[PDB]
Scaffold this motif. Structure first.
Motif, PDB file in Angstrom:
ATOM      1  N   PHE A 165     -46.470  16.017 -56.100  1.00 40.52           N
ATOM      2  CA  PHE A 165     -47.302  17.209 -56.014  1.00 40.52           C
ATOM      3  C   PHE A 165     -48.218  17.317 -57.242  1.00 40.52           C
ATOM      4  O   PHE A 165     -49.400  17.684 -57.121  1.00 40.52           O
ATOM      5  CB  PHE A 165     -46.435  18.465 -55.865  1.00 40.52           C
ATOM      6  CG  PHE A 165     -45.837  18.637 -54.486  1.00 40.52           C
ATOM      7  CD1 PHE A 165     -44.699  17.924 -54.101  1.00 40.52           C
ATOM      8  CD2 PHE A 165     -46.444  19.476 -53.545  1.00 40.52           C
ATOM      9  CE1 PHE A 165     -44.189  18.040 -52.809  1.00 40.52           C
ATOM     10  CE2 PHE A 165     -45.920  19.586 -52.252  1.00 40.52           C
ATOM     11  CZ  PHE A 165     -44.799  18.864 -51.894  1.00 40.52           C
ATOM     12  N   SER A 166     -47.690  16.922 -58.399  1.00 44.42           N
ATOM     13  CA  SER A 166     -48.436  16.948 -59.651  1.00 44.42           C
ATOM     14  C   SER A 166     -49.574  15.932 -59.620  1.00 44.42           C
ATOM     15  O   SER A 166     -50.737  16.289 -59.825  1.00 44.42           O
ATOM     16  CB  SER A 166     -47.489  16.622 -60.808  1.00 44.42           C
ATOM     17  OG  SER A 166     -48.153  16.693 -62.068  1.00 44.42           O
ATOM     18  N   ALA A 167     -49.226  14.667 -59.389  1.00 41.04           N
ATOM     19  CA  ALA A 167     -50.198  13.578 -59.324  1.00 41.04           C
ATOM     20  C   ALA A 167     -51.292  13.788 -58.249  1.00 41.04           C
ATOM     21  O   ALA A 167     -52.462  13.436 -58.438  1.00 41.04           O
ATOM     22  CB  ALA A 167     -49.468  12.274 -59.091  1.00 41.04           C
ATOM     23  N   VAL A 168     -50.929  14.429 -57.146  1.00 35.02           N
ATOM     24  CA  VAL A 168     -51.902  14.658 -56.093  1.00 35.02           C
ATOM     25  C   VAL A 168     -53.001  15.682 -56.444  1.00 35.02           C
ATOM     26  O   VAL A 168     -54.177  15.474 -56.109  1.00 35.02           O
ATOM     27  CB  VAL A 168     -51.207  14.968 -54.734  1.00 35.02           C
ATOM     28  CG1 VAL A 168     -52.205  15.475 -53.729  1.00 35.02           C
ATOM     29  CG2 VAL A 168     -50.537  13.707 -54.180  1.00 35.02           C
ATOM     30  N   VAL A 169     -52.631  16.766 -57.133  1.00 36.79           N
ATOM     31  CA  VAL A 169     -53.591  17.796 -57.546  1.00 36.79           C
ATOM     32  C   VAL A 169     -54.681  17.190 -58.414  1.00 36.79           C
ATOM     33  O   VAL A 169     -55.842  17.580 -58.338  1.00 36.79           O
ATOM     34  CB  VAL A 169     -52.918  18.907 -58.369  1.00 36.79           C
ATOM     35  CG1 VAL A 169     -53.912  19.996 -58.687  1.00 36.79           C
ATOM     36  CG2 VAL A 169     -51.725  19.489 -57.606  1.00 36.79           C
ATOM     37  N   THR A 170     -54.320  16.204 -59.221  1.00 41.77           N
ATOM     38  CA  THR A 170     -55.318  15.589 -60.086  1.00 41.77           C
ATOM     39  C   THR A 170     -56.242  14.697 -59.273  1.00 41.77           C
ATOM     40  O   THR A 170     -57.457  14.753 -59.445  1.00 41.77           O
ATOM     41  CB  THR A 170     -54.690  14.813 -61.284  1.00 41.77           C
ATOM     42  OG1 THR A 170     -54.040  13.621 -60.823  1.00 41.77           O
ATOM     43  CG2 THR A 170     -53.674  15.672 -61.987  1.00 41.77           C
ATOM     44  N   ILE A 171     -55.686  13.918 -58.342  1.00 38.17           N
ATOM     45  CA  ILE A 171     -56.514  13.044 -57.503  1.00 38.17           C
ATOM     46  C   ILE A 171     -57.494  13.882 -56.687  1.00 38.17           C
ATOM     47  O   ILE A 171     -58.687  13.602 -56.701  1.00 38.17           O
ATOM     48  CB  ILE A 171     -55.673  12.152 -56.578  1.00 38.17           C
ATOM     49  CG1 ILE A 171     -54.838  11.201 -57.425  1.00 38.17           C
ATOM     50  CG2 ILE A 171     -56.591  11.284 -55.691  1.00 38.17           C
ATOM     51  CD1 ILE A 171     -53.756  10.513 -56.655  1.00 38.17           C
ATOM     52  N   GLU A 172     -57.008  14.942 -56.034  1.00 38.57           N
ATOM     53  CA  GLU A 172     -57.888  15.813 -55.247  1.00 38.57           C
ATOM     54  C   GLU A 172     -59.020  16.318 -56.139  1.00 38.57           C
ATOM     55  O   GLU A 172     -60.189  16.316 -55.758  1.00 38.57           O
ATOM     56  CB  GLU A 172     -57.112  16.997 -54.669  1.00 38.57           C
ATOM     57  CG  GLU A 172     -56.042  16.583 -53.660  1.00 38.57           C
ATOM     58  CD  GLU A 172     -55.156  17.726 -53.172  1.00 38.57           C
ATOM     59  OE1 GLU A 172     -55.296  18.868 -53.685  1.00 38.57           O
ATOM     60  OE2 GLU A 172     -54.303  17.462 -52.276  1.00 38.57           O
ATOM     61  N   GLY A 173     -58.671  16.686 -57.361  1.00 41.51           N
ATOM     62  CA  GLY A 173     -59.675  17.181 -58.278  1.00 41.51           C
ATOM     63  C   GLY A 173     -60.674  16.159 -58.769  1.00 41.51           C
ATOM     64  O   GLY A 173     -61.874  16.404 -58.732  1.00 41.51           O
TER      65      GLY A 173
END
Ligand SMILES: COC[C@@H](O)[C@H](CC(C)C)NC(=O)[C@H](CC(C)C)NC(=O)OCc1ccccc1
Length: 212
Positions: free
Chosen positions: A28-36
């Motif tokens: 969940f952490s790593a995904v928020v950064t990729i989306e951003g």
């Protein structure tokens, strides 16, 4: 860098997810950064797959916590799939990557922010959201519910979450415990207390995806 930063008003951050019993936080952490990073680059915002990291990261421990810098490495070698394409089951099930077709996106690299330094962590946040860790084992964090969080809490970091902004005395954090926790799923942890460790441990390990 500016005084205030709130990635949400730049159309760069998606709705609050919930993680359920699974120790999927890292994903969940790593995904928020990729989306951003991608919206920041491309111009489009798309939800990505937490289940994908959760199932395909060989260096993490599935629903038993993991390393957002490895999952973030994963999305650097191969890539990541959209969320609808590889939806979240909340249990670790085999690596259905290739069996889903061509990845939705891939990033050029992973990176580390100089630790125990609230300044570097701000330079970075002012570019794109970043992976950050803290301590939630405590009743105070669990029971948080609005306002600027100060504690009490140790520095025994466990939970992983994302930093999507900051202001004069707080760092805006997007957590995955639903929208019925904190400020609609968000938490404003106080900064500028001199503590080299950061409140709750907020400065122990910080990483972000590179995207040319
Ligand atoms: C029973 O809690 C023990 C812990 O250590 C673990 C934390 C682990 C992720 C480090 N569990 C939790 O924090 C729980 C349960 C879910 C939502 C994760 N979270 C929680 O209760 O916060 C969400 C919440 C939201 C609205 C009202 C009351 C609670």
């Amino acid at each position: 860098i500016p005084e205030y930063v709130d990635w949400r008003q730049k159309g760069a951050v998606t709705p609050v997810k919930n993680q359920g019993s699974c120790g999927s936080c890292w994903a969940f952490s790593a995904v928020v950064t990729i989306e951003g990073i991608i919206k920041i680059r491309t111009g489009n915002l798309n939800q990505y797959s937490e289940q994908e990291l959760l199932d395909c990261d060989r260096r993490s421990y599935g629903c038993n916590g993991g390393y957002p810098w490895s999952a973030l490495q994963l999305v650097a070698q191969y890539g990541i799939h959209y969320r609808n394409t590889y939806p979240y089951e909340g249990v670790q099930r085999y690596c259905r990557s290739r069996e889903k077709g061509p990845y939705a996106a891939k990033t050029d690299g992973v990176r580390q922010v100089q630790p125990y330094n609230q300044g570097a962590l701000l330079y970075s946040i002012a570019n794109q959201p970043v992976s950050v860790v803290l301590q939630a084992a405590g009743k105070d964090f669990q029971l948080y519910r609005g306002g600027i969080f100060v504690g009490p809490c140790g520095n025994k970091v466990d939970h992983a979450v994302a930093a999507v902004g900051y202001g004069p005395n707080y760092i805006l954090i997007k957590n995955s415990w639903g929208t019925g926790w904190g400020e609609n799923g968000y938490i404003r942890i106080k900064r500028g207390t001199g503590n080299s460790y950061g409140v709750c441990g907020l400065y122990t390990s910080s990483f972000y995806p590179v995207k040319n």
